[PDB]
Design an enzyme around this catalytic site. Structure first.
Site, PDB file in Angstrom:
ATOM      1  N   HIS C  43       0.807  -1.216   0.000  1.00  0.00           N
ATOM      2  CA  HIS C  43       0.000   0.000   0.000  1.00  0.00           C
ATOM      3  C   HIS C  43       0.843   1.270   0.000  1.00  0.00           C
ATOM      4  CE1 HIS C  43       0.435   0.232   4.491  1.00  0.00           C
ATOM      5  NE2 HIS C  43       0.329   1.523   4.234  1.00  0.00           N
ATOM      6  N   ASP C  95      -0.404  -7.483   1.961  1.00  0.00           N
ATOM      7  CA  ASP C  95       0.157  -6.148   1.833  1.00  0.00           C
ATOM      8  C   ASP C  95       1.686  -6.248   1.864  1.00  0.00           C
ATOM      9  OD1 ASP C  95       0.397  -3.441   1.717  1.00  0.00           O
ATOM     10  OD2 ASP C  95      -0.232  -3.053   3.786  1.00  0.00           O
ATOM     11  N   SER C 194       4.266   3.004   8.389  1.00  0.00           N
ATOM     12  CA  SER C 194       3.731   2.025   7.454  1.00  0.00           C
ATOM     13  C   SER C 194       4.847   1.489   6.558  1.00  0.00           C
ATOM     14  CB  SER C 194       2.663   2.685   6.587  1.00  0.00           C
ATOM     15  OG  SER C 194       1.494   1.898   6.546  1.00  0.00           O
TER      16      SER C 194
END
Ligand SMILES: *[C@@H]1O[C@H](CO)[C@@H](O)[C@H](O)[C@H]1NC(C)=O
Ligand SMILES: *[C@@H]1O[C@H](CO)[C@@H](O)[C@H](O)[C@H]1NC(C)=O
Ligand code: NA
Ligand code: NA
Ligand code: NA
Ligand code: NA
Lengths: 248, 30, 248, 30
Positions: C43, C95, C194
């Site tokens: 992502h 992911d 992230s």
């Protein structure tokens, strides 16, 4: 060592063999803790009930020996130090002794010292069920003589069960290990394994630590019985005193 | 001493001996 | 990183920062897994709900950066590989993405790769209560911008509790971590963290392994909520395929 | 790769970082 297996080459580079100098006689196991100090059980050196009272000149130690059938180092001793409160009279409490080599030994792929535990390592690993490893040249039982060093992994046993297995008064300077009847695995140290190391590998730093010294037991690999080991950490202050102050 | 407990033919060469895993597993097993 | 602390120099040498090339913009965290491969969250590269779809020429990665206020390496990317079944449509399942550096990077005291788990390591350490470590340059919360890399240790959480904390359909390709309300400690990854690594130190060989990738969560360090991480071992076969077959 | 996960300024110099013990203890604690 009973019910153990052949050690791999270089698996126990701190292994030391204690011999009567002449005539040749294997007496006990021992361990290398520095280039000039060897750790063993006091009863391997001093044990009146057996008319045993060896002095420095009566012995020799061999370091680096993987089997029977060079690369092996034979060293003389300069001085022996037995814990002042070692009790050979009753229960072998404080069964520990240090032997200073006449000359420092050179380390190799087969000769390397083991670490002695600090408080944190002892607190973390001396727990019921946690496994240690014992190595030695003792017979393969109580009747059986190895030509390759033997090794066996054994779990530490809860103190109430250790207390239970014997009539002897045990102390906090001892711990016991071995499988219980019905755990389905066997193994024990025996005779000449006496004085040898009980080691554990630290999950914190990947180093091997000597947590115990083969001290006594009743019989060898008998159901319901466990081997008793000298609690090395409990006697660390004395060990440190000797090594720190002397060793010249 | 400072290099204590690390075996030349095992830890120093990143090699495991045949049963050391049995020991370590006993420490982490629940 | 919320409720964490300043990382020591060289504590996380596999830390990688993903940047938009020009204008400069910190986008995500990432990790070095070899001299030419960097691992991150898919992502961070492809996320249509956000009109995000970066190509190789749009980015740069920085390796070896300990703080803000040389020794730092800036690398271009040759190719991006996103897991073919990465699901940005529903729950961010799978992911994960790999980025191949244009040229291999030289390792140093500040640049060194992290290991990827094997079956045995994953089986042993992916257990409820076992702590991992997350590092990153995300804000210090959700309002708070660090000039030194931040670090926080968090425990893996039992799956039923992870399931419970969110309405999103979670999968076995994710695991969650963080403290529970009342465990009395806090901490979480956040925003720009992230893509960064969730690592654990093996008690078997003393090496650090990357068990997860910061993936998603709801809010940052909120009571009753946990951060979700991509289960690296579960996607090892794809990772290996890419690295083994390509990398020319 | 083969030297993966061993930090030059920590494992390689036999030095522990400030909180790694917290991780390892969580694995062996009963
Ligand atoms: C061992 O022999 C020495 C003689 O050098 C003696 O002083 C010591 O008391 C003896 N230990 C015994 C018999 O318990
Ligand atoms: C991202 O952009 C490429 C154009 O290079 C396109 O082929 C791919 O389908 C795009 N992914 C999206 C919008 O989901
Ligand atoms: Na027994
Ligand atoms: Na455990
Ligand atoms: Na939370
Ligand atoms: Na344990």
């Amino acid at each position: 060592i009973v019910e153990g297996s052949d050690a791999e080459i270089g698996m126990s580079p701190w292994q030391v063999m204690l011999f009567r100098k002449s005539p040749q006689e294997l007496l006990c196991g021992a361990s290398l803790i520095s280039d000039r100090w060897v750790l063993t059980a006091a009863h391997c050196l001093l044990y009146p009930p057996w008319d045993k009272n060896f002095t420095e000149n009566d012995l020799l130690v061999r370091i680096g020996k993987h089997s029977r059938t060079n690369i092996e180092k034979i060293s003389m001793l300069e001085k022996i130090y037995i814990h002042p409160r070692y009790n050979w009279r009753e229960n072998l409490d404080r069964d520990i002794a240090l032997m200073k080599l006449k000359k420092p030994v050179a380390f190799s792929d087969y000769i390397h010292p083991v670490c002695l535990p600090d408080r944190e390592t002892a607190a973390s690993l001396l727990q019921a069920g946690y496994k240690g490893r014992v190595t030695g040249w003792g017979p393969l039982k109580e009747t059986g003589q190895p030509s390759v060093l033997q090794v066996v992994n054994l779990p530490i046993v809860e103190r109430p069960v250790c207390k239970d297995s014997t009539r002897i008064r045990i102390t906090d300077n001892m711990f016991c290990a071995g499988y219980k009847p019905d755990e389905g695995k066997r193994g024990d140290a025996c005779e000449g394994d006496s004085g040898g190391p009980f080691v554990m590998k630290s999950p914190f730093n990947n180093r091997w630590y000597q947590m115990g010294i083969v001290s006594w037991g009743e019989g060898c690999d008998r159901d319901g019985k466990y081997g008793f080991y000298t609690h090395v950490f409990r006697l660390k202050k004395w060990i440190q005193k000797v090594i720190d102050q002397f060793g010249e | 001493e400072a290099d204590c407990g690390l075996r030349p033919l095992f830890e120093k060469k990143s090699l495991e001996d045949k049963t050391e895993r049995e020991l370590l597993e006993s420490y982490i097993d629940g």
